[PDB]
Design a binder for these strands. Structure first.
Lengths: 60, 118, 91
DNA sequence: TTTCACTTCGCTCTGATTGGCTCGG
DNA sequence: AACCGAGCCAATCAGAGCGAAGTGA
């Protein structure tokens, strides 16, 4: 469900942002890249190896 | 007028609470002894989001400072607006659909039509 | 750069947490959604300020340009509330 | 020529990132 | 019954902050 008329103060900037996000989508593919399970290998391996309690928590 | 967006699309108790929250924000922003090194959001990351636009060249330190504060108020009022819908459905967990429902109440949020499709 | 197109999720999720009751939980789904909304909020307002700066042949986006852009785009409450905040920063 | 207002550099130090388990929904 | 998934914990290290140096109008 898409309306023809949105906020009159925002409509023109919305169109320009659609163009701007399309150009970033073409060059970086970021709009469709998706989310990695984790950002950093070093911080992942850290979290994996860390001493854990019986409840799966990081230890005191 | 200027403050129409505070209460726009809200009913009963929600109206009073969001109005009181905005009066709390206004009182804070009007206060005389700010520490401009204390923010919930990092200034460098706000500045990087701005610089994602190739039309943007140079940015005054003022702009990320205003956004740090503005973004806090935005996240807070939208989360509070979204919570209404979780309470309506007798849920203790906020879901994506609660934010989507909240956006539909005020035309202030029309700029997010593509970010949270209807 | 993929992490750089948003503000850190922990910072966004903390502000959401403080906005809700003590017993409330937030779906990962909702934290990611809010993260995307906030980044569009910055980019949407910045784009408006940026185009006016290019038209007036000014290289630097400043605080006053952000406030003007907020008013233009129908965030009048944000611009008016942050106006006092900018003037106190500049003194 | 110096000044102004930003960027980029270099570096220090800090707080965001991170997953196995529980148990309410 | 079976399944799903968000809070819980805190140490590393990516990067946020900051002074110095670089840039140019």
């Amino acid at each position: 469900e898409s309306p023809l008329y949105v906020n009159a103060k925002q409509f023109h900037r919305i169109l320009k942002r659609r163009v701007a996000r399309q150009k970033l989508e073409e060059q970086l593919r970021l709009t469709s890249k998706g989310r990695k399970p984790y950002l950093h290998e070093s911080r992942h391996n850290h979290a994996m190896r860390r001493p854990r309690g019986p409840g799966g928590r990081f230890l005191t | 007028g200027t403050w129409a967006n505070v209460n726009q699309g809200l009913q009963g108790t929600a109206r009073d609470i969001l109005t009181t929250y905005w009066q709390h924000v206004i009182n804070h922003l009007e206060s005389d002894n700010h520490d401009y090194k204390i923010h919930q959001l990092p200034l460098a990351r706000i500045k990087k989001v701005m610089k994602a636009d190739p039309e943007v060249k140079m940015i005054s330190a003022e702009a990320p400072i205003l956004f740090a504060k503005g973004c806090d108020v935005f996240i807070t009022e939208l989360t509070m607006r979204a919570w209404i819908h979780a309470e309506d459905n007798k849920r203790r967990t906020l879901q994506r659909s609660d934010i989507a429902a909240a956006l539909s109440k005020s035309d202030m949020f029309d700029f997010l039509i593509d970010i949270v499709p209807r | 750069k993929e992490q750089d197109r948003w503000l850190p999720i922990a910072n966004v999720a903390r502000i959401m947490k403080l906005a809700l009751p003590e017993n409330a939980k937030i779906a990962k789904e909702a934290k990611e959604c809010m993260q995307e909304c906030v980044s569009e909020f910055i980019s949407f307002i910045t784009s408006e300020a940026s185009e006016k700066c290019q038209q007036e042949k000014r290289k630097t986006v400043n605080g006053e340009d952000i406030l003007f852009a907020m008013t233009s785009l129908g965030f009048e409450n944000y611009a008016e509330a942050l106006k006092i905040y900018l003037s106190k920063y500049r003194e």
